[PDB]
Amino acid sequence: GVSGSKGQKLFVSVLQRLLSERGLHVKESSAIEFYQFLIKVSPWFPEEGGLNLQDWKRVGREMKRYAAEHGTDSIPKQAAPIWLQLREILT
Amino acid sequence: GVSGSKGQKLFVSVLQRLLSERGLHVKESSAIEFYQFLIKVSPWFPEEGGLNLQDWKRVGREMKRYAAEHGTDSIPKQAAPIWLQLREILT
Numbered sequence: 635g636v637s638g639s640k641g642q643k644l645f646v647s648v649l650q651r652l653l654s655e656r657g658l659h660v661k662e663s664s665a666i667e668f669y670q671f672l673i674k675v676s677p678w679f680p681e682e683g684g685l686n687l688q689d690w691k692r693v694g695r696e697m698k699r700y701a702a703e704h705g706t707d708s709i710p711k712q713a714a715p716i717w718l719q720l721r722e723i724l725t
Numbered sequence: 726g727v728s729g730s731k732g733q734k735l736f737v738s739v740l741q742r743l744l745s746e747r748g749l750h751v752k753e754s755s756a757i758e759f760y761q762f763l764i765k766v767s768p769w770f771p772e773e774g775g776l777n778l779q780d781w782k783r784v785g786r787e788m789k790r791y792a793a794e795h796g797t798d799s800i801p802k803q804a805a806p807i808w809l810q811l812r813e814i815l816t
């Protein structure tokens with residue numbers, strides 16, 4: 635399998651359950667944009683990471699480095715909001 | 726001055742616009758509930774407040790104060806998430 639969208643539908647489905655139980659809703663295309671950004675910046679996360687603060691704080695650091703190095707317009711507008719909400723959910 | 730449903734449609738319309746531009750969407754019912762909660766804890770905000778980080782931080786303190794006195798179970802589950810997104814917008 636060499637699909638470009640591996641894990642995408644699972645990620646979207648999980649993201650959408652976690653966010654919807656806090657009253658927030660992301661468009662599918664936007665959820666997919668975020669996922670592609672996450673696996674670009676932090677490909678180790680699905681493989682070795684968990685839904686805990688240490689790992690999610692690391693994903694944050696790595697996304698921030700990416701912004702600093704590439705400018706805040708190669709980044710999806712929804713990346714910081716979604717990251718932030720997941721951080722809080724993990725708290 | 727706040728009073729029942731007064732200001733509610735306008736508050737909701739601005740809130741939805743601000744959130745939506747960041748790729749986060751709230752149901753109208755959740756936004757109404759968030760408004761009723763804000764005006765309960767911080768009725769000064771429409772009257773004397775401004776849409777700035779300092780006043781929003783006060784609103785934040787007052788919502789946590791309300792949680793402390795009445796317990797986590799009394800407050801809408803979307804309250805903290807919405808407040809947090811608006812705080813980022815204001816940064």
Ligand SMILES: *C(=O)CCCCCCCCCCCCC
Binds near residue numbers: 635636
């Ligand atoms: C998903 O599409 C998995 C694809 C795996 C293809 C493997 C083919 C390997 C061909 C080279 C073999 C050389 C060793 C005999």
